[PDB]
Amino acid sequence: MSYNYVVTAQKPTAVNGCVTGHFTSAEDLNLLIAKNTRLEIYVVTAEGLRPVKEVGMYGKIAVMELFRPKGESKDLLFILTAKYNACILEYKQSGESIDIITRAHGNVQDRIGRPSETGIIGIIDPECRMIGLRLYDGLFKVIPLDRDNKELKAFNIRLEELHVIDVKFLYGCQAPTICFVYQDPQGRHVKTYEVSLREKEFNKGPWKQENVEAEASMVIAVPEPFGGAIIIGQESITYHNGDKYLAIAPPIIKQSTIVCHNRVDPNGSRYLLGDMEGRLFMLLLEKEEQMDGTVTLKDLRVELLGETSIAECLTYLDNGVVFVGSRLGDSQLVKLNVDSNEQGSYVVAMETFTNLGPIVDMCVVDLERQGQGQLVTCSGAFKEGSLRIIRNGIGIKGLWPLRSDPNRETDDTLVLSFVGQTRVLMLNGEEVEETELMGFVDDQQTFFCGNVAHQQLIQITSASVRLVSQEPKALVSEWKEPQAKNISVASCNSSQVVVAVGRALYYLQIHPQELRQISHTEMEHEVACLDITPLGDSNGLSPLCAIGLWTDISARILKLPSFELLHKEMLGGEIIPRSILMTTFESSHYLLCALGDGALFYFGLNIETGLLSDRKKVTLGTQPTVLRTFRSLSTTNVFACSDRPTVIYSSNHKLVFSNVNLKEVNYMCPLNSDGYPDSLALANQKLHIRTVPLYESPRKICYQEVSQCFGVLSSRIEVQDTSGGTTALRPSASTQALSSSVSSSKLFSSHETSFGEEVEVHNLLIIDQHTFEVLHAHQFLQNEYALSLVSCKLGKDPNTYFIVGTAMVYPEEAEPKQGRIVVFQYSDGKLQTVAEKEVKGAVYSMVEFNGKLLASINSTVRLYEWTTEKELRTECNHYNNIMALYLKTKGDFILVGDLMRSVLLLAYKPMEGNFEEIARDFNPNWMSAVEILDDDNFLGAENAFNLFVCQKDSAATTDEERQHLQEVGLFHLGEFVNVFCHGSLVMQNLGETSTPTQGSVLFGTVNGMIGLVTSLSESWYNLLLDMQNRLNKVIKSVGKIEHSFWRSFHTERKTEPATGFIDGDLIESFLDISRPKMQEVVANLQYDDGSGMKREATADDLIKVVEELTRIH
Amino acid sequence: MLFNSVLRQPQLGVLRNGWSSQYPLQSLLTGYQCSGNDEHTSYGETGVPVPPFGCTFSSAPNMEHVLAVANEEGFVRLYNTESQSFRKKCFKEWMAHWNAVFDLAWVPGELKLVTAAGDQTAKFWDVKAGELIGTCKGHQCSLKSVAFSKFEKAVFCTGGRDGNIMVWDTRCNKKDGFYRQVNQISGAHNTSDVDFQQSVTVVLFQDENTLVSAGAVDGIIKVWDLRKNYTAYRQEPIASKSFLYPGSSTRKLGYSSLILDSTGSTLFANCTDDNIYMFNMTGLKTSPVAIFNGHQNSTFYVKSSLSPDDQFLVSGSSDEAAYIWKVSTPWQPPTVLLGHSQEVTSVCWCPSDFTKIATCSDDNTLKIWRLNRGLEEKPGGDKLSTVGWASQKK
Amino acid sequence: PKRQTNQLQYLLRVVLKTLWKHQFAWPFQQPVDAVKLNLPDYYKIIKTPMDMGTIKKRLENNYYWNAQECIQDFNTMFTNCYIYNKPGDDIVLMAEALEKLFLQKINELPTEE
Amino acid sequence: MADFLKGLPVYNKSNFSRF
């Protein structure tokens, strides 16, 4: 059995291209960005970048532009995905219903043809007549824009030039005219063609071919005032227009090559060009008029503006601001100031959209030190690599829950706090000051206060009853101090106010139209807030007077007037929680009392009965229920808050354990002010991100709990100059470290570079778990690339060791030949080496097997034993592989990967000592990631954005038949998966109580998606696949694209449909449709629970199932 | 460069290098080895070695490792190349033709094959049952090559030494147990001006209605459209696409063998002027973009093959060894695969394994070579247990 | 009395091989017709212009009854190439090189067992 | 005074002149 469920915890956030136009309406600009498949449209406004819609398409969006045909007000959008599917989208809005309609959908994949090396290029005629696609090598797809072509019937034109490096459109031509730069054995040339749809061929072209430089990157289309084409490449900027060949070689563009570009001035008087290193160059077009009417170009200029993120998208929105889109870094909203500043650069950032980027590795750690797991990844690359931390959630002690002012709020009453007193100051905004005034008593300090009825408020003061207000204006019912008893385990509500003044007391509910004598019987149980909490604001009758008491916790429900006598069950519970929480959706009220003494009662309150509940026995301390309320929406519930950390989700009668974003909650609740959405009230978007910038690209990360440290491999790129050996480029975290160390391997001593060469130096950084500051940065040797890291316990040695494998790399050789396996110990402050163990090869990935160690030398799986004399000794070898890249272990099973071969599961032989080959997969896969799910299922992630799971079938005969593993399940994730890990964001225990999560596995991809993979049962999988197929039949796709077509396995040669893999966004879209759509689906479903009983297909019964499925999300 | 690509893959993420794969494995060509255990010897029924001609892999699911070696005595054999059992390597062997076979083809994704020879017929066998399913009588002279469509499994092509080319459809019903030619073209490659010259050498299937053919002395490549029917067509057939010979010698040059990539846009033709030309089919460029030289194609019996990822070309030679060229860089010297005493006549790279490559030569021995890295092997023989080695031309 | 004798194995295994591995035997291993060669005299002079592809079909079909009947249809092949194929010509010359080789192996063909 | 950054095209002034 291997039936897997895959879901997406966090959406991808790596920008793949940007457009700007009047998409939503003809009066506002837009910013449309499609990260990997998720397409978000932002409407440009004064408040910032307000999102208006995000959609999920079944395909990796690759070609994106906006075109405005004649006869249409708002311009349509053309989308081409990585599965060769073309869609034309239009923004349709009717008052509030926002939807995107597909005016023309089609499939443009050709059975024959080689895919292009650059990728996929889409071009639009400036007058919006036809669509040009550079899909396959040697072909040029052309789609007419005639409205009868709803099915997108295109035609392919054959051109003589095969290796076309770029193709774009021209300007000012009556007929559709394109220009392309191409590579031939004679060099790189630029040629123009006049494409005509009437003859369906290519004409001669406006101007002849011109020999451009050997490194022409891409072409820029200059608008009508100047026309022609712009060719930018490494060390060259040229302008070609008929008889004009104005070319310059600026000395500033020499460092790197331009990647992205955009046009700012509508007439074409200014351009922005990106760079590989993040520099944002600007291109100036100097114009001049000759005689009358004719305008030509004077000269070209380039200028450096500043440094930005790693530029893959550049767009100019409005008012001198630029959207800097990034693939390996966070996106930026930079501002182009007219005047410069210090360290002169006209680029100043305004907003930073977080991007997970190329997640290389990840690991699960426990900062809380309880036993649960939080993710930490080595995000980013090049100069902007960081250490972003992903977690689950949603000395400032004490809050202001008094939302007295309906709109002004801020701070009007300084309600300051100590033991059994009252500090209430009149404030003007958040101005708080330690200027004690004698007008109001200030030696007192408040816990709580309340209102009674008809705003006959009470000025609680020991001196005199001086009501500073206009409504009551009387000395009636001041909160007296019979024994100097201020709020000391005391409280009051608002609908009714029951106090305990001394011991004999006339019920203080004597207010205008609020008269009652119920708490007149002598109460022997003085409660903090002895009262009832109504079901809304009902008063004057007795709809539900049954509340109960928690002093003895009896089945009898004690109403307030009774106060009877029962068995003396005064338990040890006296510790106070924070609150019990008003939290439900529309109409369901429950009573999850905080009975943390034992048998935590998460009552699913049946109002009438309230008998029992699903009890989760969490044996914690002495914590009874404490009544407290803060209100945010139409909510009526409470919350069990026992001693050992318990943070819950809102459910019917069950519970989960999670984290609140605040790291300390004694008397805490955040604000409701909606002023700053970027800087939220998150003290320290369901998953929260904490960013620690290292200013250098990390490679591998591991955690040690004995010293509570993070060991991270990192690579720093420095320009190598002969004057001084090597000079740094930017100050990274390695240079700005508290300590430093340089490796010294005397036995392993074994070229020269130029002044313009660059050197990648690999370092190991030790980072504290609390402050996340670098402590020690051990620097490796020259031409030393480090490719592994593991903190492990070896043999009988009580110490834990950081083991790093590394290899020499020289520009001459293609494969490393010599390497080493270095062992470090972190005693205090300094990393001390122990052993070197020089190995002729290249270490790739190392995992602690069973107290010994296993290596991943090229074409070699070796076992090393940590002897008593502190050195590694070889134990056994296995050479039946090309070279083992990624390796995972579980028990006695060693899942060995290969870059072009397949799963190579090996079994250790304790009696023999050498490895054996139980089975091996015999298919070509081009593997990229390996994981072992269970004792039988082995899962892998590919280089062509694919997922698969194979099994070691035990039904085969006692022969070579069992030596084969068949691909049980296949899936097309559509993303380049990079790392697999074990854990979950939910509290990681007690998940076997019929919950459909049999083993949770995280995966992190290159584009920055966190994903969950779990296992189900056979009946669960069959029901779930059937319901998914029914929903796919019922629901309408965003771009008229089939879900099964998109999820089907698709390599370069095989296109078998996806089997044995339940999808994640389609399953969770069931909760995002209207009730008639719930009735359209599940109309004749079975909903098999046992074998054949209870076949009714209740919509709520499937809603509960989907909720249980999305609990692990 | 391979290690650099591997290291840079996680940070950047999927970069296209021209061909249908990444990781430019150029540095592991000099690691192909064939031990004396994996080598296979073809022994005749009378005891005399028989030189195999025609040995290709398969495409059926879960049985892609079987080989299709056929010797000159008609004893067609089906082997197994993956498992290391060393006992009874010849899984199947039977008599299909009473004459000397010439070429073998398999229907994609099925356990059936087609055998061709000078019997003037083509036999359609079902190897899962071992029965003579079909007979394809209708050739006036001997047969030379048979090919199956990658996309279509029911129709296929057959070319004869008479200078005739007909497509046989298995969906058609035989009238007396003999198949009938659905469409026939006569004199497909006749000299520009019934003999040794009027004979098509290789006929390959491009897509569901296109055929690429090359003959003996015309020296040109003719691509026909099978949608345009040739029922009567009482004239010399015209070619939808024509590819002339870009040579210098004025002799009766020809194309010994032809192969296509995994897509169908690049065509590699091994001419008999010690050259291999590569042509583009998607474009309209009739001139060859790239050529390869170094192997001697003196005999019309030499074939060639492509790697599964379409990166490297392997071919026979008169140097008693196989030659391997890199597609992207033809200027570099090739890699020679020494070990064979006599002429190599056919080489086949596995369509679903970069490692196993089967070379069947005129030395009456078929050798299945596999990648051999990790020079620090366990002891027990250095040169004794080795009958072939890879070397760079220098 | 029909029976199996080592001489029919001779003409059925390796003498039939020499018939099949016979040089200049090219147009006869295909059963002869008239429309394909546009020679109508072949079927009008002789009622049954049989070739030895047909005798191959019939010996693998085991239709032949007597060894005398088998050698009689073989010398009927002889007689057909003598009566239709004109003597004193190139065609009867290559058919007679064929005839020389068959005379040699009918010398090689022994008696029964 | 510099022409490379001067007179950028603008919509209504209350577009990016707040927050």
Please explain how this structure is put together.
The complex is a heterotetramer of chains A (1113), B (394), C (113) and D (19). Chain A is mainly beta. In chain A, 4% of the residues lie in helices and 33% in strands. Chain A has four domains: 379 residues, Methylamine Dehydrogenase, Chain H (7 Propeller); 341 residues, Methylamine Dehydrogenase, Chain H (7 Propeller); 294 residues, Methylamine Dehydrogenase, Chain H, CATH 2.130.10.10; 98 residues, Orthogonal Bundle (DNA polymerase, domain 1). Chain A contains five helices and 65 strands. In chain A, strands 44, 45, 46, 47, 48 and 49 form a six-stranded antiparallel β-sheet that branches. The radius of gyration of chain A is 35 Å and the shape is globular. Chain B folds into two domains: 168 residues, YVTN repeat-like/Quinoprotein amine dehydrogenase (Methylamine Dehydrogenase, Chain H, 7 Propeller), CATH 2.130.10; 148 residues, YVTN repeat-like/Quinoprotein amine dehydrogenase (Methylamine Dehydrogenase, Chain H), CATH 2.130.10.10. In chain B, strands 1, 2, 26, 27 and 28 form a five-stranded antiparallel β-sheet that branches. In chain B, strands 22-23-24-25-29 form a five-stranded antiparallel β-sheet, with no helix packed on it. Chain B is globular. The two termini of chain B are 22 Å apart. Chain D has no helices and no strands. The termini of chain D are far apart. Helix content of chain D is 0%, strand content 0%. Chain D is largely without helices or strands and 19 residues long. At the A-B interface, loops of A face helix 1 of B.
Number of strands of chain B: 29
Count of distinct structural domains of chain B: 2
Name the CATH class of chain C. Mainly Alpha
**Structural class, from helix and strand content of chain C?**
mainly alpha
Number of helices of chain C: 6
Shape of chain C: globular
CATH superfamily of chain C: Bromodomain-like
| Helical fraction of chain B | under 10%
Strand composition percent of chain B: 35-45%
Content of β-strand of chain C: under 5%
Largest sheet data of chain C: none
- Number of helices, counting only DSSP H or I runs of 4 residues or more of chain B: 1
Write the H/E string of chain B, N to C. HEEEEEEEEEEEEEEEEEEEEEEEEEEEEE
CATH homologous superfamily grouping of the largest domain in chain B: YVTN repeat-like/Quinoprotein amine dehydrogenase
**Alpha-carbon distance between the termini of chain B?**
22 Å
Modified residues (N-acetylserine) (chain A): 2
Pfam families (chain A): Beta-prop_RSE1_1st, Beta-prop_RSE1_2nd, CPSF_A
Organism (chain A): Homo sapiens
Modified residues (N6-acetyllysine) (chain A): 1040
